[PDB]
Design an enzyme around this catalytic site. Structure first.
Site: not given
Ligand code: HEA
Ligand code: HEA
Ligand SMILES: CCCCCCCCCCCCCCCC(=O)OC[C@H](COP(=O)(O)OCCN)OC(=O)CCCCCCCCCCCCCCC
Ligand SMILES: CCCCCCCCCCCCCCCC(=O)OC[C@H](COP(=O)(O)OCCN)OC(=O)CCCCCCCCCCCCCCC
Ligand SMILES: CCCCCCCCCCCCCCCC(=O)OC[C@H](COP(=O)(O)OCCN)OC(=O)CCCCCCCCCCCCCCC
Ligand SMILES: CCCCCCCCCCCCCCCC(=O)OC[C@H](COP(=O)(O)OCCN)OC(=O)CCCCCCCCCCCCCCC
Ligand SMILES: CCCCCCCCCCCCCCCC(=O)OC[C@H](COP(=O)(O)OCCN)OC(=O)CCCCCCCCCCCCCCC
Ligand SMILES: CCCCCCCCCCCCCCCC(=O)OC[C@H](COP(=O)(O)OCCN)OC(=O)CCCCCCCCCCCCCCC
Ligand SMILES: CCCCCCCCCCCCCCCC(=O)OC[C@H](COP(=O)(O)OCCN)OC(=O)CCCCCCCCCCCCCCC
Ligand SMILES: [Ca+2]
Ligand SMILES: [Mg+2]
Ligand SMILES: [Zn+2]
Lengths: 59, 121, 236, 269, 534, 51, 55, 102, 133
Positions: E243, E92, E316, E319, E127, E290-291, E438, E241, E256, E245, E157-158, E62
């Protein structure tokens, strides 16, 4: 031995895909196609064995 | 008969006259010897100074009213034009698509762009 | 101490670390909530006011004053909510004379506790494995996937250094009620300090994937009185 | 020219590639290689011939792709100034990616060395491993690599100056210098006290050195193809991208080797 | 037909191939998420007969399918390849064969990931592929190797796409565009390309060393030999991380454009938008640790990293506030893309606030590897990526396909997915704060309550997905009929409140980008004479 | 080179002039996409006990 | 005549900003002073009772 | 550089005076009303003159409709329309709310 | 310029039938009304003014709204039906699944609560775990 102009003439006047324009394209393209087909078909046949759990006998 | 090698930019007639003669026996080829096609055409334009592949930006000196619209030359029956105002960047970018039949008006600065084609495809 | 159905907050604290991090979380959520309320109200009013606006103010682009205001406003919010973060981080990191030190080694789908400082008969180290009670072996009343075969007995109101390590994969020693969560890499030791303020039972689990038996490997810490802890240790 | 003639050309310097099978063919070969090596390291495939066949297919597909790109550059004349600049920039980005791969390997080495594991003896190299002396073979390797860089610069300047013989001689002798570096590194591999499986020291050491070895093999291949092209009058005095490409590759790889030498030999011993 | 698609060389065909693959992989990942959320609805082995390894395999599949095969092929691949040449006036994309090979190595990564799931046991490491769980001792069989190869293929690819995008936007800009006049989506794609370029090599090195440890008996992370899995954690998160972003920045670029076109006023501080995206991309590389606050880093390291992670909230926040400023004072045409953009704003702010609460090295002790983390990253990922994709599709599809979609069904789908995603992802915060770990297929029966209602939410979201699949069908067979009748929105910008209907009919398109001036589905190679700009 | 342009000429699949209805192909594509995890689960449960 | 009327959007912006700050402040004040202070009061009361029964 | 109210008024009086067709009149009126200020009665006078010059009744009604939708209070709109009563009666342009009585 | 005035049979109630007319009739009406515009605007009758205003700024064609007067109810009904069908499918698949854990009983959880009360677990919070019947 300075064949660039002759090959430019050959390449710019040819109703063929770019890799077939050289006179010795077939020699490099037919064996390659055969080897590529073999090398792509072979590994997929071994996937059902991997799913089934059967390893290759050390004979 | 036989076609020449298009010694300058005024004798180019088709892509088949842009080949030229190569190096003689044992010297490195030069750009004028073995360049062909579009690269040869660009090289010629560089030697006689006529810059092929025009890259001049849009005419944004005047407003271009309906009676005397800004004329834009094209090699196709339409052309896209992004205008920003009577100065270089007065208003935001406004993209227009003037064609042969219909002129393009900005709706923000009022500039009228009229297309004239080179044509002969 | 133990999770409650339909709960939305932390478990009840028993160590200064857990209540400190709870206070930090509430203090941070205060400013997070003021920001969320601001953003939500602005979105609300802008959408419902300008979804019926015929004329768009298409000439408002830069606005330097509000630009600098929201450039320097998040910074001051972050500093405000980062002062107590640093205070707590540097306060809970200190190891100040632990009156007890005990090891917790995480083996594949079980734990092994070892009270290296104490004795069983004369000097010899005390140790025991803590297996999870199987669902078929549960008597009516015990908690599924949460109550272990043997409990980790600990005196109350004493400084305790948990030295956690592992043997095969990375096993996380995590008790949320005590506010401790430190992993266990097989290479190196990890020490954490705790002081339990009230007797009772405290349940936690492993917060790190370790294979099939990651779910069925809990941690049960039973904090008792000091004379009772000594009696249990001598009986151990 | 007149409008009649200017209407018969591209109108923009950029290159319209004709449809080609090489992308999908290389993708299929890469998939077959990955699948075969995944089923062979775990005994589902009895021998390693399939991995060899997949590698050969991938190599031939890449060769055919480069045969198409040199046909476009030399015989169709599609490489104008903008296309050349774009290709040079893309190769710079690819070189940057390789440098970051090497930086990740260097990070692994520094993490393994600065905090030595207690099972290693708390000293680098770990107890039981005698490190390769830097002064005997690697000094020769680095001096011949700097010589190869200077020589390829000499050959490039001679090619620009218009002298064919000096350019060919310099390119040939630098190709030979690089193929001697490869031979000497292989020799150093053969008579080595430790193997890639003898702990983290050997692991990271051979990881970095073998990555550089593979890059040097690729560089020798590029020098060989450049020598063929220059020999048969493909490279002109003012239009050569692949040769500037291999010069940039040679210099960046020499810098990488200098860093690798210092870190793995004058700091790791 | 074979030459056009198998032998493809133009960016639009490769983009639509990318989109088809992305939606297929997203459907597969949503099926895995549905299975996970159905099994995880009540305590006890309900649908999977025990078999926690199968649950872990589904979690890995997933996460990978959503991240590396849905968000990136669609955002970076599909939209990036279709629009970047169009927005900058490039005829192109440069390196077209590289553009084709990136797409064509994607589905083969899919093939090997699937066969990894099918082989002896499957990859059950998460993952993240942390050792020694992913070493040869704990995971035998070729499944982990095949997942490694899938990650290598998608990295190839990326990286190739990033090089192509960088070269195209640096060299092939039209004659009037300086870098300062580029559209915001182009800037977002350019910055994301540099992030991929500087991130993927580290992931490749770490994953290759893991594979060597697994199969070549070497010890990079083996504790028996001097290794340390913390090195793998460092490398993987240094990749990962940036990734996330990479996943989110193109969403910022799309939002935008949608806001500027459905508020009928330009973006508030576009140059500040570019600066904020650049700062976010630069700061993504400095906060990776921080992870891994739990692994036992020094107090000073965690103190630096919490500050560095908190700093990202400033660009952020800029923005977010500028998007609200752009919406303010406009004429909001509440179409489906604008609804998705507004939901993006709100729910991404919620997710970022949870992340800021997570950035603290003291609060991460109570939240690490709980369901608070899954709530946070599912909010940010799901919302800010899937909603951005929905907005981009509903915004550009009538221009790409010449077929116009039903609008009532689109709004119903938006509302259904909005409520379902909120229902599934909000109780995860309560579960995490209460102490639910988790990556567990079974939990103490005190966490059942929320795990029930969240399991309801998926059944809503997927249903909206199904409706989306119907909408595509309704778009692909009734698009022209939708244009002729009144079931769709034909003009994304309504006439101004002085402008007559005929004056608008002669100037129907008023856009800030070239993409909307192009005809029904754009010619196979447009921009014959280069587009000019002042 | 010159490929056909039009409303349905931009997509790899055929919609209008079809022998079988397009709904079959359109929904089968996403149905096999959705059934991939079910096939994987069935296989991984067969190799244990059950179905 | 008509006095020049202008600057309405700036006034609206500042009014909306201060009103949103007030709403967020009310929400967070309710959060803190009700929920967090109730939890703290319960904890302090329990610990005081425990210390009393220790005597 | 930000403009004052008098400079804005003079600029738009001019820009309405050199408007030559319906497209230009509508464009000038649009970008006149897309500001953080209600145009002065002289600018509305020039807009009505331009609408009469290009022979377009509906845009003259739209001028008053936009003024109503732009002004803050229901009393300042009355102050605008009773000040422009003479010119509105002279050109014969009817208000939108009195043209469609409902 | 033009004749006396536009025919009433062709100008009345233009709002209710403008979209149903052929383009030729629309163009003829527009041309006639534009020729009538050149007269002093006091001479135009009220139906002519209404027709011209509706032609220019009428809510048709480009000004057609996003939702056509009945779509808010339709989307509300659609989202409600989607929610109901989602919960129905969830209930159906919950019925066609394995059995519920042995520990999800009233009696088992009362005993668990008694044990937790023995240990003084969660003193100020809540230790009661029932959640079931
Ligand atoms: C892209 C990232 C992404 C998205 C969108 C989702 C969406 C969902 N995810 Fe998950 N998930 C992860 C990435 C994502 N997840 C990752 C990285 C983990 C960590 C694994 C790990 O820790 O080992 C995780 C783990 C995770 C957990 C925690 C499991 C665990 O730790 O035990 C759960 C539990 O509910 C879950 C379920 C779901 C469900 C029900 C949705 C629902 O929101 C599904 C509904 C979503 C849609 C309907 C998307 C639309 C479908 C499209 C095809 C897009 C269409 C648009 C265009 C084509 C333009 N996934
Ligand atoms: C869509 C991708 C995405 C984005 C954009 C972010 C954005 C951020 N993430 Fe996250 N993060 C994940 C995807 C993402 N993350 C994934 C996939 C994991 C789990 C990985 C794994 O365990 O497998 C994760 C887990 C993760 C951790 C690890 C925790 C742990 O597992 O132990 C932390 C800790 O710092 C973190 C923090 C943040 C912060 C501070 C931002 C910031 O960029 C967000 C900043 C935005 C705001 C704060 C709101 C907008 C701002 C305002 C409205 C201004 C006012 C706000 C203030 C004054 C504070 N996230
Ligand atoms: C939107 C923000 C609203 C937050 C809480 C609303 C829910 C009401 C509720 O859940 O509050 C009711 C609960 C009742 O449950 P209990 O814990 O008393 O159970 C007792 C044991 N049996 O009280 C609370 O715990 C208060 C809420 C806790 C909130 C902390 C968790 C974080 C949730 C949101 C995450 C952040 C989102 C973005 C915000 C910056
Ligand atoms: C930290 C404070 C808030 C941060 C951000 C909040 C949310 C951001 C979204 C804002 C929406 C509208 C912005 C665009 C409007 C625009 O562009 O307006 C710009 C216009 C014109 O520019 P000018 O005349 O300023 O300058 C001339 C050249 N630029 O005039 C304005 O309207 C300015 C409004 C100023 C607002 C200042 C803040 C008001 C109070 C703040 C403190 C309140 C706390 C009190 C506690 C209860
Ligand atoms: C330690 C490290 C060891 C590695 C060192 C290895 C050295 C590598 C040497 C390779 C150069 C020789 C190749 C061409 C010889 C020749 O003749 O092919 C060229 C021949 C005859 O020449 P021509 O004048 O007609 O050119 C015409 C060129 N089109 O044309 C042909 O049939 C056409 C196609 C030939 C097939 C291969 C040539 C195409 C160029 C791509 C080659 C890329 C390979 C790079 C990686 C291996
Ligand atoms: C995708 C991109 C990945 C980029 C990161 C690559 C990181 C790994 C570097 C590989 C170098 C391995 C090496 O060169 O190994 C050199 C060693 C040296 O042998 P020895 O000195 O022990 O001999 C003993 C007496 N001294 O050979 C071996 O023992 C076998 C190594 C394992 C089998 C080959 C693996 C090759 C992987 C290539 C990956 C290329 C991509
Ligand atoms: C893998 C093996 C590596 C060997 C690479 C051989 C390069 C041959 C290509 C060539 O020679 O292509 C020649 C073309 C243009 O040549 P030119 O303009 O100089 O022609 C002058 C004639 N008038 O260069 C390029 O576009 C540069 C591309 C360089 C490719 C880098 C290698 C790719 C590594 C990926 C793995
Ligand atoms: C490995 C990754 C190789 C990246 C090459 C980037 C160099 C710059 C560039 O872009 O080189 C451009 C060439 C192709 O360009 P083209 O024919 O599309 O362009 C036509 C106009 N220039 O790339 C390649 O030969 C890729 C070769 C792939 C070889 C197999 C690799 C599989 C692993
Ligand atoms: C979006 C966030 C929530 C999704 C939908 C909410 C459904 C609520 C529900 O299903 O109920 C929620 C439960 C039902 O309590 P109960 O008495 O049924 O508990 C049965 C066993 N004791 O309330 C609680 O436990 C407390 C609720 C407080 C927090 C609610 C905040 C969000 C609503
Ligand atoms: Ca279950
Ligand atoms: Mg962890
Ligand atoms: Zn303009």
């Amino acid at each position: 031995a300075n064949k660039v102009i002759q090959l430019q003439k050959i390449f710019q006047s040819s109703t063929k895909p770019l890799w077939w324009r050289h006179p010795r394209s077939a020699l490099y393209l037919y064996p390659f196609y055969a080897i590529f087909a073999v090398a792509v078909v072979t590994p997929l046949l071994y996937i059902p064995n991997a799913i089934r759990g059967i390893k290759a006998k050390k004979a | 008969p036989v076609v020449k090698t298009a010694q300058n930019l005024a004798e180019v007639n088709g892509p088949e006259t842009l080949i030229g003669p190569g190096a003689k026996e044992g010297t490195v080829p030069t750009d004028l010897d073995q360049e062909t096609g579009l690269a040869r055409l660009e090289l010629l334009g560089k030697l006689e100074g006529i810059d092929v592949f025009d890259t001049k930006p849009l005419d944004s000196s005047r407003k271009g009213t309906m009676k005397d619209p800004i004329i834009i030359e094209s090699y196709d029956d339409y052309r896209y034009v992004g205008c920003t105002g009577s100065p270089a960047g007065s208003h935001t970018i406004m993209w227009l698509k003037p064609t042969v039949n219909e002129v393009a008006r900005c709706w923000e600065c009022g500039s009228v762009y009229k297309l004239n084609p080179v044509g002969v495809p | 101490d133990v999770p409650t159905p339909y709960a939305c907050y932390f478990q009840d604290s028993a160590t200064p670390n857990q209540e400190g991090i709870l206070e930090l979380h509430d203090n941070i959520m205060f400013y997070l909530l003021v920001i969320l309320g601001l953003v939500s109200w602005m979105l609300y009013t802008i959408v419902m006011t300008y979804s019926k606006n015929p004329i768009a103010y298409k000439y408002i682009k830069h606005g330097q004053t509000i630009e600098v205001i929201w450039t320097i406003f998040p910074a001051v919010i972050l500093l405000i909510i980062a002062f107590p973060s640093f205070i707590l981080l540097y306060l809970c990191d200190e190891v100040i004379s632990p009156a007890m030190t005990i090891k917790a080694i995480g083996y594949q789908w079980y734990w092994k506790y070892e009270y290296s400082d104490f004795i069983n008969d004369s000097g010899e180290t005390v140790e025991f494995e803590s297996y999870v009670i199987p669902d078929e072996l549960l008597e009516e009343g015990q908690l599924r996937l949460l109550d272990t075969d043997t409990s980790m007995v600990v005196p109350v109101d004493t400084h305790i250094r948990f030295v956690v390590t592992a043997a095969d994969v990375i096993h996380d020693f995590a008790i949320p009620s005590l506010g401790i969560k430190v992993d266990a890499t097989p290479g190196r030791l990890n020490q954490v300090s705790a002081l339990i303020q009230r007797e009772g039972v405290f349940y936690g689990a492993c917060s790190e994937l370790c294979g099939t038996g990651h779910a069925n490997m809990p941690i049960k810490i039973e904090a008792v009185s000091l004379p009772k802890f000594l009696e249990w240790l001598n009986e151990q | 020219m007149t409008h009649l003639e200017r209407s018969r050309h591209q109108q923009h310097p950029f290159h319209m590639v004709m449809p080609s099978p090489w992308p999908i063919v290389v993708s299929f070969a890469l998939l077959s290689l990955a699948l075969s090596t995944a089923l062979t390291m775990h005994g589902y495939i009895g021998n390693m011939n399939m991995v060899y066949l997949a590698l050969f297919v991938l190599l031939t597909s890449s060769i055919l792709w480069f045969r198409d790109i040199v046909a476009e550059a030399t015989y169709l004349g599609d490489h104008t100034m903008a296309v050349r600049k774009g290709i040079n920039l893309g190769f710079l980005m690819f070189v940057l990616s390789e440098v970051l791969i090497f930086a990740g390997l260097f990070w692994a080495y520094f993490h393994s060395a600065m905090s030595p594991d207690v099972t290693l003896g708390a000293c680098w190299p770990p107890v039981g491993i005698e490190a390769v002396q830097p002064t005997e073979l690697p000094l020769l390797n680095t001096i011949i690599l700097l010589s190869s860089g200077a020589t390829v610069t000499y050959s490039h300047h001679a090619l620009i100056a218009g002298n064919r013989n000096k350019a060919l001689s310099g390119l040939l002798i630098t190709f030979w210098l690089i193929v001697i570096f490869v031979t000497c590194q292989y020799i150093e591999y053969t008579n080595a006290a430790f193997t890639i499986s003898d702990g983290v020291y050997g692991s990271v050491f051979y990881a970095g050195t073998g990555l550089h070895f593979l890059h040097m093999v690729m560089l020798a291949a590029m020098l060989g193809v450049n020598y063929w092209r220059m020999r048969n009058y493909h490279l002109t005095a003012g239009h050569h991208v692949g040769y500037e490409t291999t010069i940039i590759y040679t210099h960046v790889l020499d810098v990488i080797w200098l860093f690798l030498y210092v870190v793995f030999y004058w700091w790791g011993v | 037909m074979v030459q056009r698609w198998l032998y493809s060389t133009n960016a639009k065909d490769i983009a639509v191939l990318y989109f088809m693959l992305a939606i297929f992989s997203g459907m597969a990942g949503t099926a895995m998420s549905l299975i996970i959320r159905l099994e995880l609805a009540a305590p006890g082995s309900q649908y999977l007969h025990g078999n926690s390894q199968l649950f872990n395999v589904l979690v890995v599949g997933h996460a990978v399918l959503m991240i590396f095969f849905l968000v990136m092929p669609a955002l970076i691949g599909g939209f990036g390849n279709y629009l970047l040449p169009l927005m900058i006036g490039a005829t192109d994309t440069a390196f077209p064969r590289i553009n084709n090979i990136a797409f064509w190595v994607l589905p083969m990564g899919l093939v090997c990931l699937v066969t990894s799931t099918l082989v002896e046991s499957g990859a059950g490491t998460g993952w993240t592929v942390y050792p020694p769980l992913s070493s040869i001792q704990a995971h035998s069989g070729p499944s982990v190797d095949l997942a490694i190869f899938a990650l290598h293929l998608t990295s190839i690819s990326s990286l190739l796409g990033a090089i192509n995008f960088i070269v195209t936007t640096l060299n092939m800009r039209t004659n009037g565009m300086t870098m300062h006049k580029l559209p915001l989506f182009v800037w977002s794609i350019f910055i994301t390309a540099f992030l991929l370029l500087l991130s993927l090599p580290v992931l490749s090195a770490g994953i290759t060393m893991l594979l060597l440890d697994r199969n070549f008996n070497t010890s990079f992370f083996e504790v028996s030999g001097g290794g340390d899995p913390i090195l793998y954690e460092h490398l993987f998160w240094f990749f990962g991380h940036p990734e996330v972003y990479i996943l989110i920045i193109p969403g910022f670029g799309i939002i935008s454009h949608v806001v500027s076109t459905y508020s009928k006023k330009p973006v508030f501080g576009e140059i500040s938008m570019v600066y904020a995206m650049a700062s976010i991309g630069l700061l993504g590389f400095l906060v990776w640790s921080h992870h891994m606050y739990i692994v036992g880093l020094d107090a000073d390291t965690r103190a630096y990293f919490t500050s560095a992670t908190m700093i990202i909230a400033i660009p952020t926040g800029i923005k977010i506030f500028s998007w609200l400023a752009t919406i303010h004072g406009g004429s909001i045409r509440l179409a489906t893309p604008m609804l998705y953009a507004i939901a993006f704003l709100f729910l991404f702010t919620m997710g970022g606030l949870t992340g800021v609460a997570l950035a603290n090295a003291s609060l991460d002790v109570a939240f690490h590897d709980t369901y608070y983390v899954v709530g946070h990253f599912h909010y940010v990922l799901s919302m800010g990526a899937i909603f951005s994709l929905f907005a981009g599709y509903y915004y550009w599809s009538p221009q790409i396909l010449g077929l116009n979609y039903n609008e009532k069904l689109a709004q119903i789908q938006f509302w259904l997915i909005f409520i379902g995603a909120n229902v599934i992802f909000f109780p995860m915060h309560f579960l995490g704060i209460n102490g639910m770990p988790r990556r567990i297929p079974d939990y103490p029966d005190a966490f059942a309550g929320w795990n029930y209602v969240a399991s309801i939410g998926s059944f809503i979201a997927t249903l909206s997905l199904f409706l989306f699949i119907y909408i595509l069908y309704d778009q692909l067979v009734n698009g022209l009929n939708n244009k002729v009748n009144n079931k769709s929105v034909i003009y994304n910008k309504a006439p101004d409140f002085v402008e007559s209907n005929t004056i608008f009919n002669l100037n129907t398109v008023k856009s800030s980008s070239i993409e909307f001036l192009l005809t029904s589905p754009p010619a196979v190679h447009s921009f014959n004479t280069p587009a000019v700009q002042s | 080179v010159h490929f056909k342009d039009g409303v349905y000429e931009n997509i790899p699949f055929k919609v209008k002039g079809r022998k079988t209805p397009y709904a079959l192909s359109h929904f089968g594509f996403f149905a096999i996409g959705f059934a991939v995890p079910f096939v994987a689960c069935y296989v991984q449960l067969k190799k244990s006990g059950a179905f | 005549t008509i006095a020049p009327i202008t600057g309405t959007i700036k006034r609206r912006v500042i009014m909306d900003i201060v009103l949103g700050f007030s709403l967020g402040g009310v929400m967070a004040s309710y959060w803190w002073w009700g929920f967090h202070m109730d939890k703290i009061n319960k904890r302090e009361k329990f610990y005081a009772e425990l210390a009393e029964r220790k005597k | 550089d930000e403009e004052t109210f008098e400079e804005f008024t003079a600029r738009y009086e001019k820009e309405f005076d050199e408007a030559y067709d319906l497209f230009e009149v509508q464009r000038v009126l649009n970008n006149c009303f897309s500001y953080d200020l209600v145009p002065a009665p002289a600018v509305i006078e020039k807009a009505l003159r331009a609408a009469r010059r290009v022979n377009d009744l509906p845009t003259a009604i739209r001028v008053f409709e936009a003024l109503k939708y732009k002004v803050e209070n229901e009393d300042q709109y009355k102050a605008y329309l009773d000040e422009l009563k003479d010119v509105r009666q002279e050109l014969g342009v009817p208000l939108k709310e009195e043209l469609f009585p409902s | 310029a033009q004749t006396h005035a536009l025919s009433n049979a062709a100008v009345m109630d233009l709002q209710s039938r403008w979209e149903n007319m052929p383009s030729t009739e629309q163009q003829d009406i527009v041309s006639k009304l534009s020729e009538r515009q050149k007269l002093p605007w006091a001479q135009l009758t009220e139906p002519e003014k209404q027709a011209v205003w509706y032609i220019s700024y009428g809510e048709w064609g480009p000004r057609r709204p996003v939702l056509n007067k009945g779509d808010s109810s339709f989307i509300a009904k659609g989202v409600a039906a989607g929610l109901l069908f989602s919960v129905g499918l969830f209930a159906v698949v919950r019925m066609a699944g394995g059995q519920d854990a042995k520990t999800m009983n009233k009696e088992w959880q009362l005993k668990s609560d008694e044990y937790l009360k023995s240990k003084n677990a969660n003193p100020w919070g809540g230790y009661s775990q029932v959640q079931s019947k």
